[PDB]
Symmetry: C2
Subunit: 674 residues, 2 copies
């Protein structure tokens, strides 16, 4: 229980050590384990893997990722496979409730993210709080396990965490590198003739689509069918339908995988590839940091990705997916270069990843100071410097500046001793960034004076996140929709701040330059467009209909859905902690409605993990209006309802599931819910 930080090339079973450590710790100390994964997809994959592995030892495994959360109290859980942001929230809530002693270990995967990143600082703060609380109260308190690629300063991280060090560059499939100067037809032909699949990464999404189409054309012209047809049918029965280009590419074992698709389509392509059924997949940069998806031959189209040299970490994690342990002898990754790109290619071939930074006036420091002060762990400035000493920045004078920033904005109160008033406690328990909480407070307080209850648009405007640019807003379409809007929605539009003059400016004049800080007025109209999209989402309209009506593809629609669900949950917690009972009551339902994009009727019927938003409606239309009603039904009835030995329906973390047994698991899990 002396902590641990180790690194090893992926595909070497590096998570094996972590799984055994979780087993030993949870079985001996009977304490909790937090498994922190960087992204939601890998988080779900790991959650299902842990569930499958450990279901036989009477141990629960349920994770806090995305907009979801375990259906059971955290007390019953034994392993929590959460994400970085939600793991930080978990740590903050545990500190607030004075139950840190319940925690037995915090396993962290992909520790290299702790450096330069928009979410690495959350990991740094989480680990810093663990170290601080462990040092203040005492050698079996809380173990930390870390995983990553070859880190130049891995020993520095181990010293920071007071953990052992273990780094070995061993992989069952050695990776060979000998540059030999598109000329891809013969290469792909000789790769396929060897009975091997191909994974090729492209810089753009349209470029990936086009390359998949071209490769399908090559294979169709020049040169199992049952499983391919099964995958085709699986793709067909989806809310968003089947892509035309995907339609003409899939039958030839060639397809594409980009952020434009929906999560279900991406899952279908990934699962098809893992079986070898897809012989060519044109992916993008996102898949590099996605689920474990090995391929004998990996292809990288160009060192230039998005108008800049491809990152060394991205290249390393792309090449790490070259070779299969147990069936391959040697994998291969090829980076096609050019005369001008030869220098970039040779530069990327050599050199390890850059050193890990700290990313700590800065919003991260204000966040950390708030966390410690309102967590009741660093109240007096005497001990608050020990926390700064515990940070990775120290291990590798802004505290006074940030502390003042919190008192100026009434986040904390001074008495020598600092305390939170109500926005410090509402900000920390809400897991909202203190910088944006001022705007959130101002907007919510304004809404409660003049709220519009005719429709859900005013509630949607308050749970609409604009922390990132999900899509390039089309302003002519937006103006047309504004013209077509009813009066009920226009009332809320005027209330929030949307002006017809600004839309008139944008429809014809170029995007107004937001040079001045006071031009958050641009963010208001983007937020209103997003809120209209969200209203269409929760009105249960098809993804394609929204895509044509607003210009946002289905992938961006789903990403906005997840962001709005998480933001609605966060705002609900904020309002609950601020004592805004009517606001909390209005916002409580919306988290699930955004999560699933369903109407108020289906909220109870989506508590079954096996019931989608489309499957909730067909079961709801048939006459099942509640989980209890589902619990009382024959398998054959739901089977025929769904139909109106070969696998068609798709669900996350699935198995050899067919329509026959799919209905059986709906009632079985419905019974368990009761």
């Amino acid at each position: 229980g002396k902590n641990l930080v180790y690194s090893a090339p992926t595909s070497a079973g590096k998570t094996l050590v972590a799984e055994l450590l979780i087993l030993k710790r949870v079985l001996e100390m009977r304490k909790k384990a937090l498994f922190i994964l960087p992204f939601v997809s890998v988080a779900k994959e790991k959650k299902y893997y842990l569930q499958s592995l450990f279901q036989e030892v009477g141990i629960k495994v349920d994770g806090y990722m995305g907009s979801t959360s375990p259906s059971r109290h955290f007390s019953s859980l034994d392993i929590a496979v959460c994400t970085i942001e939600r793991a930080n929230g978990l740590i903050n809530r545990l500190i607030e409730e004075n139950k840190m002693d319940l925690l037995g270990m915090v396993v962290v995967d992909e520790l290299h993210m702790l450096g330069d990143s928009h979410r690495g600082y959350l990991l740094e703060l989480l680990l810093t709080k663990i170290c601080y609380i462990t040092r203040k109260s005492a050698s079996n308190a809380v173990q930390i396990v870390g995983m990553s690629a070859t880190l130049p300063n891995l020993e520095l991280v181990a010293s920071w965490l007071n953990a052992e060090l273990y780094h070995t560059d061993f992989r069952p499939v050695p990776l060979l590198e000998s540059v030999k100067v598109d000329h891809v037809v013969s290469l792909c032909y000789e790769t396929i003739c060897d009975n091997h699949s191909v994974l090729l990464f492209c810089p753009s999404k349209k470029w990936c689509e086009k390359l998949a189409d071209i490769i399908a054309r090559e294979f169709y012209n020049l040169h199992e069918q049952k499983e391919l047809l099964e995958v085709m049918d699986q793709l067909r029965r989806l809310p968003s339908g089947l892509d035309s280009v995907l339609q003409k590419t899939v039958p030839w074992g060639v397809a594409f995988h980009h952020a434009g698709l929906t999560f279900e389509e991406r899952d279908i392509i990934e699962g098809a590839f893992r079986q070898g059924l897809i012989r060519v997949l044109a992916a993008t940069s996102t898949l590099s940091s996605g689920v474990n998806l090995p391929a004998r031959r990996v292809i990288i189209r160009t060192p230039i990705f998005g108008g800049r040299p491809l990152d060394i970490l991205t290249y390393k994690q792309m090449v790490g997916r070259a070779g299969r342990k147990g069936v391959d002898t040697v994998g291969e990754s090829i980076l096609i270069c050019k005369n001008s790109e030869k220098s970039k290619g040779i530069a990327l071939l050599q050199g390890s990843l850059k050193p890990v930074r700290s990313c700590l006036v800065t919003g991260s420091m204000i966040r950390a100071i708030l966390e410690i002060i309102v967590g009741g762990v660093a109240s007096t400035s005497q001990d608050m410097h020990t926390y700064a000493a515990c940070t990775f920045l120290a291990a590798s004078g802004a505290i006074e500046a940030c502390v003042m920033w919190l008192l100026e904005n009434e986040f904390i109160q001074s008495t020598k001793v600092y305390h939170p008033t109500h926005l410090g406690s509402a900000t920390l328990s809400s897991s909202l960034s203190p910088a944006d909480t001022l705007d959130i407070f101002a907007d919510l307080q304004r809404a409660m004076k003049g709220f519009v209850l005719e429709n859900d648009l005013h509630i949607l405007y308050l749970v609409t996140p604009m922390f990132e640019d999900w899509t390039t807003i089309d302003w002519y379409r937006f103006f047309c929709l504004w013209e077509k809007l009813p009066t009920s929605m226009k009332r809320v539009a005027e209330l929030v701040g949307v002006e017809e003059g600004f839309l008139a400016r944008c429809v014809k004049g170029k995007v107004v330059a937001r040079t001045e800080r006071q031009h958050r007025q641009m963010a208001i109209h983007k937020r209103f467009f997003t809120s209209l999209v969200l209203l269409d989402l929760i009105s249960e309209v098809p993804l394609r209909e929204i895509n044509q009506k607003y210009g946002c593809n289905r992938g961006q629609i789903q990403s906005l859905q997840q962001s709005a669900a998480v933001y609605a949950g966060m705002i609900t917690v904020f309002s609950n902690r601020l004592g805004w009972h009517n606001m909390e009551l209005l916002l409580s339902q919306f988290q699930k409605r955004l999560t699933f994009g369903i109407q108020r009727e289906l909220c109870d019927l989506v508590r079954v993990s096996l019931l989608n938003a489309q499957r909730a409606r067909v079961l709801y239309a048939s006459g099942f209006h509640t989980v209890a009603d589902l619990a009382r039904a024959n398998i054959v009835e739901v089977e025929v309802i769904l139909k109106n030995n070969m696998r068609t329906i798709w669900v996350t973390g699935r198995k050899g599931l067919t329509e026959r047994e799919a209905a059986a698991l709906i009632v079985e899990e419905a019974r368990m819910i009761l």
Copy 2:
């Protein structure tokens, strides 16, 4: 008519050459002649002097200064004694109306203000426009005469204006500067016994008052009466009454003069000092650049003014007031010093004033570009660079940045010819700075959607200027007034943006730190406090009642009065040019009501220059409700009304006026108006 730029010490008849030049030009060419003065008080004094000097030659003199404007069309005028800002506005209007050829000369006094100052850049833009128009369209077009103290780069100014150069250090009363460091009573006794006046310059208002108090006390302990009693009675019957400290200081030949007093009290004190009735006058830095008030001996309290060494220009214009031409032989300017202040004093005794800068992304450059483009004198970048060359900055590449700034904010439209749209023409005509015109547009547009006509407060909030901090707001009193406000005024308070939360924050907690640009919300509450003060002003409540109710002294109240009058006129012109007829109609009355602080009924009755706000009320309450009704009245009637050979009433630019002939002039001017 070859322009001219000359410098000479004040108190040497340095304006005689200028008066001669205006006389000759106006009589020969029969063309107008502006006379730009820096401040409103000196502008009024010069206007009255020119009126007296040229009334016998059929030359009409009436200036555009402060919140006032001539009652007759500019066409009838022969000399316009305007201020820097209003002279710039006059030239802009002349350019807009394509009647620039009416101008025969532009005499500029105190040209040293061209350098470091918040109003010098207006002078630079004015002179640059004169030069550009003269050169683009030609020997005797528009003469420019200049004046200043000893200027290190006077020849540079002459070269910029392409004018002559004359610099002379000659004064009839050669000044004898002498710094020296018990005997104070003896020095005061020997100075006063010489039958000469003394002018002290103290840094603080309170210290000036207290020093005058101690000097009066010492004169009393060590101890014409009729004329001093006349001055005392003149001070007595003023709207602000008589100051107790001034009451006990005046009758000993001692008095004080600061911005705290009212314009009428300052005028009375200055007149009494000029006649010799006041022997000792403790003034402040403001009087240094004010009216021509010579003194035999000037004394400077300490070079430390406002926590910093006294300015060199300020010190020079202080010593310039030492010596009377015609009755005195020599002048003395003593600067008492201490051990620590000896170095600063010695530094101030030696050395001339610093060179004149230009003060030209900068708002001044945006203003200049807007003026030229909207005026139709530089529509293409080819010639606009010529205007840049004409500037004093050139004579001693930001245009592209400024032109984009105007296109970004829709001040001008590109076609490559440039034009104004509506806000470019409305911004130039109103003489509003383009930086603040965006906020003004946003606020006025928002008001027209939800205007409150119950009271005059919502109109006042839109004509309240917050370009400077006229007073330090006492937030406890403001909160008390807030909780005591009616509902009609609270409606407008909530409409504009005033929140009880911010007022509560300020009432107990320290003044909130406005570290962020989004915190113009502090300016809203200061503006509302100022608008309440203005509402009490135009409601015709006494100055003392406002001072007790709000904490702002009478001098600050009058300064805010003038600022609000000018801003109301500017906003009225802005609304007129933008085509806002109802807003212009509502704002049209308020300029005069704010100029005089009267009610709607007295607005017509104050058209007589010889009628204060108090003199309009006593005549109105009697039954004279119109200027025409005044024209039909006997002198004895108005005299008895005023009562209910002694010069007891004060009026600007007065003469041996008592209540007997004061009534006579009221009816005489009433007839002239008709």
